[PDB]
Amino acid sequence: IDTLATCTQQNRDAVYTLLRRYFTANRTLLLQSDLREGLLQTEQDCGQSDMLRAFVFRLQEGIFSSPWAYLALRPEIAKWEFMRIHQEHLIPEKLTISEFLKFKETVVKGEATESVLEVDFGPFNRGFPRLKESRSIGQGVIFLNRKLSSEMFSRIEAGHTSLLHFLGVHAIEGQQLMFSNNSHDIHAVRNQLRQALEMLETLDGTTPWIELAPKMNQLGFAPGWGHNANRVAETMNMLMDILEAPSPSALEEFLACIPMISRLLILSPHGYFGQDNVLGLPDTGGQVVYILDQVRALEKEMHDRLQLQGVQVEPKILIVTRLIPDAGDTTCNQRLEKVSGCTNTWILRVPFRKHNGEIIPHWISRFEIWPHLEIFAGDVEREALAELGGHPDLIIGNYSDGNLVATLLSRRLGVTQCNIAHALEKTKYLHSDIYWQENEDKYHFSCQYTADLLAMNSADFIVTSTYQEIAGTREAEGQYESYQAFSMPDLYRVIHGIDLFDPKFNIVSPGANADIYFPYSDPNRRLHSLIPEIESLIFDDATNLPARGYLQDPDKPLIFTMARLDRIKNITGLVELYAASPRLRSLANLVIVGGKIDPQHSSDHEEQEQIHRMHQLMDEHELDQQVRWLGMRLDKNLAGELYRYIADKRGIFVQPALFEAFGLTIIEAMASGLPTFATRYGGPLEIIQNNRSGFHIDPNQGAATADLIADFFEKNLENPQEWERISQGALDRVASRYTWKLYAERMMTLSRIYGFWKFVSGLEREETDRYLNMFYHLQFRPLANRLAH
Amino acid sequence: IDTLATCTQQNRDAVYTLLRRYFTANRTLLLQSDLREGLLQTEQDCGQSDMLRAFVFRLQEGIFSSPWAYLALRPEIAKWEFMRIHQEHLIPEKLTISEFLKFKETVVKGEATESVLEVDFGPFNRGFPRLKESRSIGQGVIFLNRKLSSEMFSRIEAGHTSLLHFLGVHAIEGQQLMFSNNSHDIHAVRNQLRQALEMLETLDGTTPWIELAPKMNQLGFAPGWGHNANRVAETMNMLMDILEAPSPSALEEFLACIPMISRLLILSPHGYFGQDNVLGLPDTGGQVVYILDQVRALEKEMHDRLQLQGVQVEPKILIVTRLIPDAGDTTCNQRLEKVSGCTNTWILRVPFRKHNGEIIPHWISRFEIWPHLEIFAGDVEREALAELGGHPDLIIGNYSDGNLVATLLSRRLGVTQCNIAHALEKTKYLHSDIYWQENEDKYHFSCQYTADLLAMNSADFIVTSTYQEIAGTREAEGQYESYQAFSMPDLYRVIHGIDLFDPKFNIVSPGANADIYFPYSDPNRRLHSLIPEIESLIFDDATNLPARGYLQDPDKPLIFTMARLDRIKNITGLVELYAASPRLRSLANLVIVGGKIDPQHSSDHEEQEQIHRMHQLMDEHELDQQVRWLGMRLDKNLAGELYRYIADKRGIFVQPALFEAFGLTIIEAMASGLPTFATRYGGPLEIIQNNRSGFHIDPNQGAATADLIADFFEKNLENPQEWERISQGALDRVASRYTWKLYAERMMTLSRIYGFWKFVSGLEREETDRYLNMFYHLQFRPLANRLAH
């Protein structure tokens, strides 16, 4: 399906009529909904044309002026074509991306007095490796291993490649690691390894390193091969194997164990960061929870890896954020703050300053933050360098501000850089680029988008929680995808902004918290002592903390859900699709948690209409004695035991939100063991595999969805066996895919592999560096200096 | 010789005193002369140290504040080292250019607020072929032919060659050239060449192309292989050789003959251009003369090459400059003016406009011309494309403005770009880079030097008139060299500004004209109408015409000078050294043409104060009747015969300038057969082979100069015999190097060979292009919108 496919000139009046329908100038820029809408009638006059339907449904946008229509097609994930067609004589003509963007720029902001600067990464990226198939997008590291090992295999030469050198350039706290001297060769190294392996063969496996150490030093080995002798033999045999005939599995496993990761530096400069005073501050969401739940697992794995290799040194993680004097109550005024559940992890707060600074007291929003970032980055470099012994081994950027500071610092210190955007707004606010001048005052998107572009191009690897975050779906463009080509009129045009097939992209999903949410079938950890309390809240009555509706009749199964009550999550729509279809009304009861239940005056916020719609929907249908509505926000421990309590007896969790980005709570539920019916739109699509790990449901189809629920409830004498099929499938799904432990081993390996790639590919990328740096200085710097005006 | 040559701690007392003598802080920035001064007193204290003299004489500059001295050392041509010495405990420390330039920055303008932008062309040029020996600089085309053929060999050994495709892509005036089919296939072309050749064997030499064309066309061949069968044979044989085994000479000979070039665009937007009338106007000069005496030669050559290949089209040359609606007494408001002496060569004039423009009527100085140039370039592009049939084949820029325009124009059109700076002022004005802030109001160097860097990097080849214009001397850095690294405070820093060993640099030296300056010995062509007028200029006297000589020495040898009366042309030095030496006084008589003088102003103030010293030195030492003097300006056709007259009756020319970049005067003198005594300082060093083509004199020692001249006058019978040897020496040196015919042959080849190098090397250069385009948009554009306020 392409420009050739408008050969739909077989029915010419159809195409002509369609273009006419579009051309009526209401909006000259149409998105999908409009573009598709116009298909139906034409769809009467004249004909049907499944081909034409295919085409139109693949249109991302169009720009109509004059007798000219400029189309952007997206036939398959991450592939775009551009064309323009003449209203009267209808000949599809292929366009370059520059041509199409020039047209959009003209139609929107008018003919130009000066030539636009086109930022183009194409020349810079030409020649570096790319994934080929789009199903593969999001596992870079695999591809990268195969490329690295394939390339490395021509060590039939002086090899190999630089692995022998690379092995020598890491030292932990001044102590040289893996090799006493860098002799290179590889005939030498092969021999030393051979001798060492020989000696080892004659010692007991359990000989500790401190015995091996001096005679290993003679053979040219510094420490870090292992703790005992078995592990030394394992590691060295790995290297022997790679030096003989390198392979991707072997090279990954060996790289993964090099004791090079000691010091982490994580950037999150926006918001009020802090511990547990969170949940609802300005610019603070589960933003905090990702980082906090991660660093615990991270620190553990760091320690385990180093331990196994016999390096005794204690790892350190610094979460750097802003020191705000003006907190006054929350910890945000506190420079060093130790993190819970962690030995050497510390929050390090740093002040914003003026050029003379001058500590700059009050909180600043993320949209205003840009002018402070370079100064902040200098300051952070100083303080973080001082709190660690020296350079960090890895720098992890968070959101757009964190990624930018990561960029600056990482170029300054020469450190492997990982970016985590968590989200990129350019796609969520459609047309915020072409219309950027509209939004500069509130949103400040010129600064933020430029920062974005700079950073996704500067990173060594890029972590994302979902595939969709990167390349989207067949339907929707993905978040990074949005940056491949775009226009900022009066600023610049970007083409080749990001290569979705670059190996830098890795999906590493979060998971857990496994101390709170875990399976109902766990022998040890369940909190039995809250179970009486759980049953109070559910099956008993009245109002003391918000309620009510007193099911009684509870021999029946249970349908459970919990969320912030508001419109994305669509609780109201759940209670609603439960209202009609008396089949599942009679088949099961319904529990709801999260809510307010009488907003009062004074205070609340936002929706509150969700409350009115809830009480209203519950008054109608006679929903009490069926549905228990609880308006507490609960508690971690409590929530966890509750999920587990819904399993036994064989209950289910249903969240029909409209769209969920990642969907943490789906994971929490699944981790609990209970079968989950989740949104079809966003993360849950990837998280649950339908009728193995759980079930997909359409929110807007809830009428029909209600009858999927009842069907699961029937299923072999009131659903004993299949419920357990889904339960175990869910458990297995979480265990195999979404857990902070896997996350952390993956992350710890990635830093190693990508540090090596950086080590090899480093020189070749220097032109890219100069280009990014010239952009930062001559484009970003002024944009952030236009703030503060 | 180098950094370790400050091992002079062998005598470190002298070193300490040299540093202390430097640190006296009369200046922070110490240049060459003031560095050499510091070695003489301290001289009589303490010691001598030849090693130290070597080291000091190789310093280009040093930067002093604090205990610390920073040194820039230039050991040999185009090779630099940088170091720092501590005043108290003195040990040398090797510095990178970046380090040295940073300190230069943070001293003169003081500590930086934010990080400087370092424009770095290094990663971009990495990989491109470059010369090795400094004595080879400016020879570029030769090196390039060697790389071209060297690479063509290995490519032709594998499947393909770009030579064939490149042969395909030039169709002069709509008709296909060299090849009928588009065949990319080398075996095929070998076959066709074979047949074609064998078929030419059967016809005889002079068969005109018109006859061969259809038989040739059955064979796959379009025209342009020759005018008759002889020549077609010749060039098809060249291609056959090349396709078998490439070699540099054959390759250059074949490239040299391709009918690629029918259209020149020569750019000179500043000054008042015009045919004649222009000497003395603002921004104008002999600047125009280069262009005007070049283009006849050029036009002729271009036509010839085309004729020989049997292509009949009429070539066009456009000299494009500014339309100034203010006549200002001139022809400068005329849009299209035919250059006289040429068949198709035209000055096309184009107005400057404002952003609504709105033609700007008034003269604008070169120093202020920056903001108009992009607008100008667009306008030139349109008008010129119209006036030529289409794209020009080569674009030549002149000066800084011309070169920036050519940069813009050539990137838009995809045309080979030649740059002629004629001079680059960064070395002319001391510290005008580091101090650029001072000089902005007058000079606007922030714009100039930026455009300079841009253009030097953009051009496909750079023509200069001498070696030193590029790389200078053992003492002097060159005009281009100075852009290699420099700082421009509050704008940027450059390193790797230009590579002097890049093959793009070619010395192509002009001369003559040649209807005017020609050998005194010619069978024809001489002007005898002038011959009585001549004698009466030297020999008559007093009040009947400009004064005051009265020689009266009939057969006495002549010593001729003709110049401006100003300080650096230095006529004062010549007359002074003439009076000072009695033997020289006895051997010849000194004739002088220049100044207006005649009375001191009226007219022509105020620098003609040199008339003071003129009369002051003429009356005392009792000059008259020894030395004639004319205040005339000498209409050129006359002066030509004046040179022709000063030989037989024999005489000499003397150009005792203090410094002379090229010395066109000298070229003219030698062209006329005069033995020439020319200044050692500047291009005359290159032009005259001493004691073959002429003699070099140090205008500083008058004793030795006049002595040398005398010694020349005393040879044999009084020089029958060695005046003639040098005279023929000059004649031959002029026909073998400086002639516009030679210039034209070389230009017309350079455009073909660099056209092919662009063709072949362009895709690899794309990252360099994007970098330069970003630099332009984000750096130049702003600097020139500052003007323009």
Give, in order, the Cα–Cα distances in Å from B373 to each of A11, B368, B773. 52, 10, 16
Residues A524, A522: Cα–Cα separation, whole Å:
6
Within B245-342, residue ranges assigned H as helices are: 248-256, 287-308
Contacts of A114 in chain B (CB under 8 A): 374, 781
CB contact under 8 A, A123 and B766: yes
SS3 content of chain A, % helix, strand, coil (to 5): 45, 15, 40
- Residue B568: name the closest of B431, B660, B686 by CA: B660
Q: Indicate yes or no: CB of B781 within 8 angstroms of CB of A119.
A: no
Contacts of B775 in chain A (CB under 8 A): 774, 778
Q: Cβ separation of B778 and A781 shorter than 8 Å? A: no
Cα–Cα distance, A653 to A694 (Å, whole number): 10
- Going by C-alpha positions, the residue among B431, B475, B344, B375 that lies closest to residue B76 is B475
Q: For residue A203, give Cα distances in angstroms to A134, A200, A230, A466, B306.
A: 50, 5, 9, 48, 86
- What SS3 state is found at B694? strand
Contact B683, B468 (CB under 8 A): yes
**C-alpha distance from B111 to closest chain A C-alpha (Å):** 13
Q: Which residue of B has its CA nearest to A412?
A: B115
Q: Does A779 touch chain B (CB under 8 A)?
A: yes
Q: How far apart are CA A71 and CA A139, in angstroms?
A: 31
Q: Nominal resolution in Å?
A: 3.0
CA distance A421 to A639: 29
Q: What DSSP string describes B606-666? A: SGGGHHHHHHHHHHTTT-TTT--EE-----HHHHHHHHHHHSSS-EEEEE--S-BSS-HHH
The alpha-helical segments, DSSP class H, found in A38-127 are 50-57, 97-109, 122-125
- Experimental determination approach used: X-ray
Contacts of A350 (CB under 8 A, 6+ apart): A320, A321, A322, A323, A335, A376, A379, A380, A383
Q: Do A113 and B774 touch (CB under 8 A)?
A: no
Show which of B244, B260, B276 is a domain's final residue: B260
- Tell me the one-letter amino acid at A125: N
The verdict on A251 and A292 lying in the same domain is no
Q: Are strands B492-495 and B505-507 parallel, antiparallel or unpaired?
A: unpaired
Q: Which of A244, A260, A276 is the last residue of a domain?
A: A260
Question: From the CB of residue B20, how many other CB atoms can be counted at a distance below 10 Å?
Answer: 12
Whole-Å CA distances, A403 to A407, A420, A486, B73, B739: 6, 7, 20, 42, 62
CA proximity to B747, closest of B300, B404, B339: B300
CA distance A681 to chain B (A): 40
Of B307, B326, B313, B196, whose CA–CA distance to B257 is shortest? B307
Which residues of chain A neighbour B355 with C-beta distances below 8 Å?
113
What is the C-alpha to C-alpha distance for residues B187 and B167, in angstroms, rounded to an integer? 15
- Residues B480 and B478: their CA atoms lie apart, in Å, by 5
Q: For residue A107, give the 3-state DSSP assignment.
A: helix
Do residues B676 and B688 make contact, with C-beta atoms less than 8 angstroms apart?
Answer: yes
3-state secondary structure A368-404: HCHHHHHHHHHHHHHHHHHHCCCCCCEEEEEHHHHHH
> A770, B123: Cβ pair inside 8 Å?
yes
Please give the residue range of the domain that contains residue B230.
Answer: 130-260
C-alpha B454/C-alpha B450 separation (Å) is 6
- The strand pair at B316-323 and B263-267 is best described as parallel
The DSSP element (H or E) to which B70 belongs, if any, is strand B68-76
Tokens of A68: 């000219």
Question: Which among A656, A609, A653, A604 has a CA at the least distance from the CA of A633?
Answer: A604
Query: Which among B120, B124, B355 has CB closest to A113?
Result: B355
B513 touches chain A (CB under 8 A): no
Q: Do B770 and A117 touch (CB under 8 A)?
A: no
Please name the helix (run of DSSP H) or strand (run of DSSP E) that holds residue A682, with its range, or none. none
d(CA A349, CA A320): 6
Task: Tell me the C-alpha distance between B370 and B784, whole Å.
Answer: 6
Q: Which residues of B544-570 are buried (b: 16+ CB within 10 A; e: fewer)?
A: eebbbbebeeeeebbbbbbbebeeebb
B527 and B419 in a single domain? The answer is no
Question: What is the number of helices (H) and of strands (E) in chain B?
Answer: 28, 23
Nearest CA distance, A491 vs chain B (angstrom): 10
What residues are paired with B655 via a beta bridge? B678
E strand residue ranges, B670-755: 676-679, 695-697
Q: Are B24 and B62 in contact (CB under 8 A)?
A: no
Looking up tokens 């099956």 gives: A539
Interface size, chain A vs chain B, as Cβ–Cβ contacts under 8 Å: 60
Q: Which helix (H) or strand (E) holds B55?
A: helix B50-57
Whether residue A564 is found in the same domain as residue A498: no
Answer yes or no: are the C-beta atoms of A444 and A787 closer than 8 Å: yes
CB nearest B113 (choices: A114, A355, A766): A355
Domain with B350 in it: what CATH number? 3.40.50.2000
Determine the residue of chain B that is closest to A781 in CA distance: B114
- Residues paired with residue B678 on neighbouring β-strands, in sequence order: B655, B696
Domain finish residue from B722, B739, B756: B739
d(CA B287, CA B463): 15
From the number of C-beta atoms within 10 Å of its C-beta (0-12, 13-18, 19+), residue B352 rates as buried
C-beta separation of B330 from B277 below 8 A = yes
Sheet (strand A589-593) strand order = A627-630, A589-593, A558-562, A652-655, A676-679, A695-697
| Owner of token pair 């490149």 | B166
* Residues B437, B478 contacting (CB under 8 angstroms): no
Report the Cα B84 to chain-centroid distance in Å. Answer: 36
Residues B772 and B726 in one domain: no
Q: Are residues B26 and B43 in the same domain?
A: yes
Yes or no, beta carbons of A767 and B123 under 8 Å apart? yes
CA-CA distances (angstroms) from residue A99 to A84, A232, A386, A492?
Answer: 10, 60, 51, 14
Whether a cis peptide bond, with omega within 30° of 0, leads into B342 is no
Output the DSSP codes for A578-610. Answer: HHS-HHHHHH-EEEEE---SS--SS---S--HH
Residues A448 and A466 grouped into a single domain: yes
Number of domains in chain B: 4
Confirm if A287 and A271 have CB atoms less than 8 A apart: yes
Distance, in Å, from the CA atom of A375 to the CA atom of A358, rounded to the nearest integer, reads 12
CA distance B390 to B413: 10
Return the ∠ at Cα B736 (arms to B733 and B741), rounded to 5°: 130
H/E stretch holding B337 reads strand B336-338
Residues B340 and B460 in one domain: yes
Q: Are residues B650 and B756 in the same domain?
A: no
**Tokens matching residue B199:** 């078929």
Query: CA-CA-CA-CA torsion for A407, A411, A416, A421, nearest 10 degrees?
Result: 0
**Spatial separation of the C-alpha atoms in residues A246 and A163, rounded to whole Å:** 11
Ranges of H-type helices in A27-96: 32-37, 50-57
Q: What is the CATH number for B23?
A: 3.10.450.330
Cβ contact, residue pair B769, A117, below 8 Å: no
Nearest to A501 by CA among A92, A774, A173, A139: A139
Placement of tokens 């580091």 in the chain = B434
Which of A 117-136 lie inside 8 A of B, CB atoms? 117-120, 122-124, 126
Q: Measured between alpha carbons, how far is B302 from B296 in angstroms, rounded to an integer?
A: 10
B780 phi and psi, to 5 degrees? Answer: -60, -55
Least CB–CB distance from B767: residue in A123, A492, A773: A123
CA separation for the pair A170, A35 (Å, rounded): 56
Nearest CA in chain A to B775: A774
For residue A289, which amino acid is it? V
Rounded Cα–Cα distance for residues A666 and A509 (Å): 13
- What count of other Cβ atoms lies within 10 Å of the Cβ of residue A99? 15
Is residue B620 classed exposed, middle or buried when 0-12, 13-18 and 19+ CB atoms within 10 A define those classes?
A: exposed
- Whether residue A434 is found in the same domain as residue A453: yes
The CATH number of whichever domain residue A165 belongs to comes to 1.20.120.1230
* Amino acid (1-letter code) at residue B217: N
Which residues from chain B sit within 8 angstroms of residue A771, using beta carbons?
A: 767, 770-771, 774
Say yes or no: A539 and A661 in one domain: yes
Q: From the CA of A106, how many Å to the nearest CA of chain B?
A: 18
CA distance B381 to B373: 12
DSSP, residue by residue, A458-488? H-SEEEESSSHHHH--SSS--TTGGGSSEEE
- All residues of chain A having their beta carbon less than 8 Å from the beta carbon of residue B357 are none
Name the residue facing A771 among B113, B770, B779 (closest C-beta).
B770
Which residues of chain B are within 8 Å of residue A124 when distances are taken between CB atoms? 767, 770
B695 and B677 in contact (C-beta within 8 Å)?
yes
List chain B residues with CB under 8 Å of A126: 766
Chain A CA closest to residue B780: A778
- Give chain A's end-to-end CA distance (angstroms, integer): 49
Question: Do B244 and B266 have their domain in common?
Answer: no
B381 and B279 in a common domain: yes
A550 neighbors A541 (Cβ within 8 angstroms): yes
How would you classify the pairing of strands A461-464 and A416-420?
parallel
Distances (CA, A) of A281 to A270, A333, B413: 12, 15, 57
